[PDB]
Design a protein around this motif. Structure first.
Motif, mmCIF file in Angstrom:
data_model
loop_
_atom_site.group_PDB
_atom_site.id
_atom_site.type_symbol
_atom_site.label_atom_id
_atom_site.label_comp_id
_atom_site.label_asym_id
_atom_site.label_seq_id
_atom_site.Cartn_x
_atom_site.Cartn_y
_atom_site.Cartn_z
ATOM 1 N N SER A 53 0.847 -1.191 0.000
ATOM 2 C CA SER A 53 0.000 0.000 0.000
ATOM 3 C C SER A 53 0.880 1.238 0.000
ATOM 4 O O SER A 53 1.550 1.528 0.994
ATOM 5 C CB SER A 53 -0.930 0.011 1.212
ATOM 6 N N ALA A 54 0.860 1.979 -1.109
ATOM 7 C CA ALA A 54 1.540 3.267 -1.140
ATOM 8 C C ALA A 54 0.984 4.201 -0.083
ATOM 9 O O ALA A 54 1.724 5.019 0.480
ATOM 10 C CB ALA A 54 1.414 3.912 -2.521
ATOM 11 N N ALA A 103 3.266 5.890 2.469
ATOM 12 C CA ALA A 103 3.357 7.328 2.685
ATOM 13 C C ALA A 103 3.375 7.640 4.169
ATOM 14 O O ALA A 103 4.295 8.300 4.672
ATOM 15 C CB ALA A 103 2.183 8.037 2.013
ATOM 16 N N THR A 104 2.376 7.134 4.889
ATOM 17 C CA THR A 104 2.283 7.353 6.327
ATOM 18 C C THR A 104 3.572 6.942 7.044
ATOM 19 O O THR A 104 4.052 7.661 7.931
ATOM 20 C CB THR A 104 1.065 6.584 6.855
ATOM 21 N N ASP A 122 5.806 -3.643 6.527
ATOM 22 C CA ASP A 122 6.088 -2.223 6.691
ATOM 23 C C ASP A 122 7.068 -1.743 5.630
ATOM 24 O O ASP A 122 6.862 -0.690 5.020
ATOM 25 C CB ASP A 122 6.624 -1.943 8.099
ATOM 26 N N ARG A 123 8.145 -2.503 5.399
ATOM 27 C CA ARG A 123 9.096 -2.139 4.352
ATOM 28 C C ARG A 123 8.446 -2.219 2.979
ATOM 29 O O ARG A 123 8.701 -1.363 2.117
ATOM 30 C CB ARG A 123 10.332 -3.041 4.405
ATOM 31 N N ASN A 124 7.597 -3.242 2.767
ATOM 32 C CA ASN A 124 6.851 -3.402 1.515
ATOM 33 C C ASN A 124 6.052 -2.146 1.191
ATOM 34 O O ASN A 124 6.098 -1.632 0.063
ATOM 35 C CB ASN A 124 5.889 -4.598 1.616
ATOM 36 N N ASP A 125 5.278 -1.659 2.168
ATOM 37 C CA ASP A 125 4.440 -0.490 1.932
ATOM 38 C C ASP A 125 5.292 0.755 1.698
ATOM 39 O O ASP A 125 5.055 1.514 0.748
ATOM 40 C CB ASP A 125 3.484 -0.280 3.115
#
Ligand SMILES: O=S(=O)(O)c1cc2c(O)c(c1)Sc1cc(S(=O)(=O)O)cc(c1O)Sc1cc(S(=O)(=O)O)cc(c1O)Sc1cc(S(=O)(=O)O)cc(c1O)S2
Ligand SMILES: O=S(=O)(O)c1cc2c(O)c(c1)Sc1cc(S(=O)(=O)O)cc(c1O)Sc1cc(S(=O)(=O)O)cc(c1O)Sc1cc(S(=O)(=O)O)cc(c1O)S2
Ligand SMILES: O=S(=O)(O)c1cc2c(O)c(c1)Sc1cc(S(=O)(=O)O)cc(c1O)Sc1cc(S(=O)(=O)O)cc(c1O)Sc1cc(S(=O)(=O)O)cc(c1O)S2
Ligand SMILES: O=S(=O)(O)c1cc2c(O)c(c1)Sc1cc(S(=O)(=O)O)cc(c1O)Sc1cc(S(=O)(=O)O)cc(c1O)Sc1cc(S(=O)(=O)O)cc(c1O)S2
Ligand SMILES: O=S(=O)(O)c1cc2c(O)c(c1)Sc1cc(S(=O)(=O)O)cc(c1O)Sc1cc(S(=O)(=O)O)cc(c1O)Sc1cc(S(=O)(=O)O)cc(c1O)S2
Ligand SMILES: O=S(=O)(O)c1cc2c(O)c(c1)Sc1cc(S(=O)(=O)O)cc(c1O)Sc1cc(S(=O)(=O)O)cc(c1O)Sc1cc(S(=O)(=O)O)cc(c1O)S2
Ligand code: HEC
Ligand code: HEC
Ligand code: HEC
Ligand code: HEC
Ligand SMILES: [Zn+2]
Ligand SMILES: [Zn+2]
Ligand SMILES: [Zn+2]
Ligand SMILES: [Zn+2]
Ligand SMILES: [Zn+2]
Ligand SMILES: [Zn+2]
Ligand SMILES: [Zn+2]
Ligand SMILES: [Zn+2]
Ligand SMILES: [Zn+2]
Ligand SMILES: [Zn+2]
Ligand SMILES: [Zn+2]
Ligand SMILES: [Zn+2]
Ligand SMILES: [Zn+2]
Ligand SMILES: [Zn+2]
Ligand SMILES: [Zn+2]
Ligand SMILES: [Zn+2]
Ligand SMILES: [Zn+2]
Ligand SMILES: [Zn+2]
Ligand SMILES: [Zn+2]
Ligand SMILES: [Zn+2]
Ligand SMILES: [Zn+2]
Ligand SMILES: [Zn+2]
Ligand SMILES: [Zn+2]
Ligand SMILES: [Zn+2]
Ligand SMILES: [Zn+2]
Ligand SMILES: [Zn+2]
Ligand SMILES: [Zn+2]
Lengths: 107, 107, 107, 107
Positions: C6-7, C11-12, C94-97
């Motif tokens: 999830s971009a 972003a968050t 977390d790294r994926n997003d």
């Protein structure tokens, strides 16, 4: 955080903890709470014909399994100011089971 | 919800994550952070001769194993405005190990 | 082993864990860390106008999603001697997003 | 981090990927690798009668399910200079099943 659980137990959790205020079927009536069909993949506060608090509209989330789990842990903490009178489902397996049923009942 | 884990693992966790700012030995010196001996069973912000933030003082908790684990999960959320620069131990085994070591090191 | 995420939640993650030291947009300013636009597909330590450590320069990798995720897991392990003071994003989702977001904001 | 998996599934992994060099039963014979009965809860490099590398002895770990898992991911990375010629179980469920079998076979 969300892992698919038992729809069957989830159906009973809904009967005793939510059906009081909510219906699930397509075209079903709003009660105290809004009809819930198609809630997943939809923005907060958008069921047609239901009159929401401003805080439920303005929370501005797109409902999926995970933010639903977080919401149902503690609704009035996730959406301060909601008129949803409900303490929350504390146990994570109860949450996974209920959301499993809810997905199946509302898609 | 705290549960005794490995003090040997907590020692390692401490050497690598806390030792930079903290000592444990009885009468040890302050560094960036207060020396931590006797911390369990003391009110927050009470190590002799250390200048805490007002938030750490007014927090008004009595350190035990459980609220210590809550604190170490996200220190800036538990005590808003604390000057401790630490993200948190997100993993519960790591917090159990560290608190197991820390209780043995500072009692 | 990167997989797109999830971009939006990446972003968050960026503004909470990276923005204090980094900008992303093209021509953006260097701060503590370098501006990151164009990072993927460049050799390490090549942002024009930023003063890197020798280690970040001599590392000699071409950044993609994968080795970026290795680096963000433990920055100082991957590039011993780096002056980036960051523990790491331990969880792969977390790294994926974040990488999904970073790739969109820097390409 | 380890999760109990399928002993049976892991039993098949051991025959294909370990039994060539190892036995497991109480009193079993040494082959290329040592016999593994009682390995969990024992120091590395201790099986009575086998000639270990000094690297294996000086790793100085007391085997449990989790450092076993770490080990079997990448044996040479965990113990540089070990004489065990095994690339590693890269998949996490394979390690869970094998260790679950190994605990039952060696306790
Ligand atoms: O993967 S799931 O965990 O979701 C799951 C879904 C279904 C399923 O069969 C099972 C597991 S396996 C199972 C588990 C349990 S137990 O664990 O509860 O003891 C008892 C039984 C059983 O077969 S026997 C039984 C008992 C009752 S009851 O007397 O009314 O409770 C109704 C039905 C039924 O077959 S009919 C019935 C009613 C519903 S429902 O959700 O609409 O109430 C769903 C199903 C039904 O077949 S599909
Ligand atoms: O900030 S606010 O939370 O108030 C907020 C801002 C905006 C917005 O529309 C909403 C809420 S409503 C909303 C809430 C949630 S949530 O509850 O799950 O978070 C998910 C969605 C959604 O529509 S669906 C979605 C999913 C993804 S993906 O995950 O990357 O694939 C990208 C975009 C997207 O719309 S695009 C997109 C990306 C961003 S930004 O943050 O990446 O810059 C902002 C916006 C975007 O439209 S404006
Ligand atoms: O109903 S409540 O939502 O209020 C609620 C209160 C408590 C509790 O255990 C739970 C739910 S159960 C729970 C639910 C969810 S989730 O489903 O909502 O995602 C995530 C988690 C989790 O454990 S993980 C977590 C994440 C963070 S974070 O760094 O802030 O993200 C901090 C803490 C933490 O444990 S520590 C922490 C800090 C405080 S407080 O005093 O500082 O507010 C209280 C408590 C803490 O555990 S009691
Ligand atoms: O912060 S750290 O980067 O240090 C870090 C430490 C550990 C950890 O789990 C992580 C990050 S998270 C992580 C990150 C990455 S990434 O960075 O490559 O993307 C890959 C993986 C992974 O799980 S999968 C993997 C791949 C390989 S490989 O065959 O060598 O590639 C070996 C191991 C392994 O797990 S074994 C292994 C060996 C040791 S040690 O003590 O013998 O050094 C420690 C650990 C091990 O897991 S703990
Ligand atoms: O580990 S051992 O190989 O020594 C071994 C353990 C057990 C056991 O009875 C036997 C051999 S004897 C045996 C040998 C062979 S075989 O040689 O032809 O393969 C096939 C069968 C069989 O009965 S039938 C069968 C096949 C499968 S399958 O492999 O998933 O298809 C699962 C189960 C099952 O009953 S259920 C099952 C699930 C587990 S657990 O670990 O997942 O909890 C344990 C056991 C189970 O029986 S105990
Ligand atoms: O209940 S507890 O889980 O806390 C626990 C406490 C102790 C203990 O022995 C164990 C478990 S069992 C154990 C576990 C592990 S492992 O888990 O790390 O693989 C390795 C070993 C081992 O025997 S062999 C070993 C390795 C090293 S090392 O090379 O320096 O790491 C130092 C010592 C040592 O014996 S000396 C030493 C050093 C310390 S410390 O805390 O000051 O580091 C404590 C102890 C020591 O004996 S008591
Ligand atoms: C009566 C005491 C209720 C109980 C029991 C449950 N819900 Fe509820 N809910 C209720 C109201 C009045 C509202 C509107 C809130 C507002 O601020 O306007 C809601 C809202 C929800 C929502 C959000 C719907 C949307 O955003 O479109 C969800 C997803 C929801 N409720 C779910 C839910 C669940 C799963 C329940 C059982 C655990 C449950 N509710 C009980 C009233 C009441
Ligand atoms: C430097 C960046 C630090 C790291 C690393 C660790 N700690 Fe810390 N700690 C630090 C400061 C500057 C302060 C005072 C904060 C304030 O607002 O006044 C603290 C405080 C604590 C406390 C509270 C002590 C008290 O008397 O109330 C505890 C219990 C504590 N720190 C523990 C702790 C642990 C377990 C750490 C490793 C995970 C750790 N600290 C690292 C500075 C720094
Ligand atoms: C301040 C404490 C920082 C935080 C927070 C983040 N970064 Fe960082 N980064 C920082 C510095 C000072 C440097 C230069 C390193 C050196 O040794 O010279 C860097 C470097 C990077 C790089 C490499 C850039 C290159 O050209 O090779 C990357 C890819 C990077 N930083 C990414 C990154 C991410 C994703 C962060 C949030 C999770 C992040 N940084 C935070 C300083 C700081
Ligand atoms: C032949 C190539 C082997 C394969 C296949 C497996 N093992 Fe092995 N193992 C082998 C040797 C020659 C050694 C000794 C290495 C040394 O440096 O002395 C080992 C060692 C182990 C150990 C440690 C034993 C101890 O007392 O600490 C373990 C726990 C172990 N081996 C386990 C293991 C597993 C689970 C395997 C299948 C995935 C496996 N081995 C395969 C030789 C060989
Ligand atoms: Zn969870
Ligand atoms: Zn949580
Ligand atoms: Zn059925
Ligand atoms: Zn059935
Ligand atoms: Zn309409
Ligand atoms: Zn959207
Ligand atoms: Zn939107
Ligand atoms: Zn909790
Ligand atoms: Zn439908
Ligand atoms: Zn807990
Ligand atoms: Zn000991
Ligand atoms: Zn907590
Ligand atoms: Zn938690
Ligand atoms: Zn003392
Ligand atoms: Zn991975
Ligand atoms: Zn959008
Ligand atoms: Zn890992
Ligand atoms: Zn660009
Ligand atoms: Zn794992
Ligand atoms: Zn069987
Ligand atoms: Zn069987
Ligand atoms: Zn010991
Ligand atoms: Zn020992
Ligand atoms: Zn590993
Ligand atoms: Zn690991
Ligand atoms: Zn791994
Ligand atoms: Zn035995």
């Amino acid at each position: 955080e969300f892992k698919a659980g038992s729809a069957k137990k989830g159906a009973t959790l809904f009967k005793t903890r939510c059906l009081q205020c909510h219906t699930v079927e397509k075209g079903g009536p709003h009660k105290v709470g809004p009809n819930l069909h198609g809630i997943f993949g939809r923005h907060s506060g958008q069921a047609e014909g239901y009159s929401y608090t401003d805080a439920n509209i303005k929370k501005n989330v797109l409902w999926d399994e995970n933010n639903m789990s977080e919401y149902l842990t503690n609704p009035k903490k996730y959406i301060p100011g909601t008129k949803m009178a409900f303490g929350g489902l504390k146990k994570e397996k109860d949450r996974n089971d209920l959301i499993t049923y809810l997905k199946k009942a509302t898609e």
